[PDB]
């Protein structure tokens, strides 16, 4: 699964 801390700038639930 993706690591959400790889790029903190990325909100994975935003388009």
């Amino acid at each position, epitope marked *: 699964n993706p690591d959400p*801390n*790889a*790029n*903190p*700038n*990325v909100d*994975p639930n*935003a*388009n």
Partner: antibody
Amino acid sequence: QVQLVQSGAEVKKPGASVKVSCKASGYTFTSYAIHWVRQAPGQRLEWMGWIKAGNGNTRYSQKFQDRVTITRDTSASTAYMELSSLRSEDTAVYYCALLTVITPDDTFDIWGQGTMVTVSS
Amino acid sequence: DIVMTQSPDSLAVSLGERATINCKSSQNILYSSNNKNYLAWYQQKPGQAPKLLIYWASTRESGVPDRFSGSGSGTDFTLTISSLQAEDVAVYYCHQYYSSPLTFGGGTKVEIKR
């Protein structure tokens, strides 16, 4: 307009260290993470690490964790990357960047103009 | 590391023609739970920093022309320029943000022929 403005090009001797700065403007400094990416001549982009501007938390590529320190000064709205024990393979353009800022509201990606560091006697 | 491999390393087509760039990841970067591919495409012109064109593999950033299109899922991705404008002469890079370290492909140099 968000802007990232970096320090000027430098030459440094092998074995010495270099500290590049990255002044941010146009947004709330503490809200995002600044990344450092380098590009050796003729070669691909290489991610070095990020720093969260608000808490100062850091994450480093394994390739660089032994020799790189990323720091920030919220009062100056500036991030810094220090690379120690310089070697000829470190000659490169070093960028700071707000990489892939994907927010519920907006999406933006902003880079500094780059700083060429030459490792030479 | 998720290694990003681009193909071809260089291509040349005419103004108006279609340019295709392939990127393959060493690992699946699709998350089934949100159906998102953690991939971006960048454009880099000589002496400048890279410019974001596509994110989530297929989403164009605002301001990016509709002739740039991203496609693909899992480990196989494609950037297409439908009608090349001579300014599109640049190096194109894939990028994954699925896991650390963040990584980039080797780049695809796009040149023009008459």
